[PDB]
Amino acid sequence: PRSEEDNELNLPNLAAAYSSILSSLGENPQRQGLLKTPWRAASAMQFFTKGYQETISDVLNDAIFDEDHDEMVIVKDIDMFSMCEHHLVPFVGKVHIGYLPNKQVLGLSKLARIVEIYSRRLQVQERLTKQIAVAITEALRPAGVGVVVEATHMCMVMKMNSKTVTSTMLGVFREDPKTREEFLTLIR
């Protein structure tokens, strides 16, 4: 994983590239508003990709609870901020997660921490959706998982009203019509 030492080492290289971009665009990197921009843009781009500094293993340290719960668990409207890997422009929105446990439940905040590790990278919405669902399925081995991501891509808006929705339905969320309908009703 990416370390804070790698960040300190690469910060001047990032700032140099952003200073180069400011000049190549026809702008004056010496004006008041652009003066510190190479460093602010470099630190912002490091923060937007901080997910490369974490592993799914450390995110799930004492996140698991052995419990006999037979109920659908949903965390909806989780704010999501990611970066398009094709254009380096943000895509932003919400994640809705559902699961039917069997022998184990996850701490509610840990589901959001899973959204954080994968979204804070250069991504495509389809990969991000899958990574969240796979992480939950592997951490809990539940009867089923549902993951719905709703986002606005700035590389599509810069048409303007359009939203991208991706949906992963696994286990009983795929097989049982009642389970899938219940999850989709409860997230709206």
Binding site: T137, R141, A143, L170, G171, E175, D176
Partner: protein
């Protein structure tokens, strides 16, 4: 091992056809050209073939199996065969 359960999702004209569970006869699975996998979201292994069910049914007939029942459950067509 007299009973056998096989299935396919709609459309019936196309595979995959599920032909077994973890405790299925490995020689019969090998004969059908089946592969073992644990599909994402499932907590169990299954045997499947790419063939549509009509082809699997003909292969099972040559192994001494006979269809006793066929049923639909959700989007799945299931056949119950017996070694007779």
């Amino acid at each position: 091992m007299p009973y056998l359960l096989i299935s396919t999702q709609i459309r019936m004209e196309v595979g995959p056809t599920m032909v077994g569970d973890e405790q299925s006869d490995p020689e019969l699975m090998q004969h059908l050209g089946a592969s073992k996998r644990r599909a994402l979201g499932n907590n169990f292994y299954e045997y499947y073939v790419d063939d549509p069910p009509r082809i699997v049914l003909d292969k099972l007939e040559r192994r001494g199996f006979r269809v006793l029942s066929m049923t639909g459950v959700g989007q799945t067509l299931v056949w119950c065969l017996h070694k007779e």
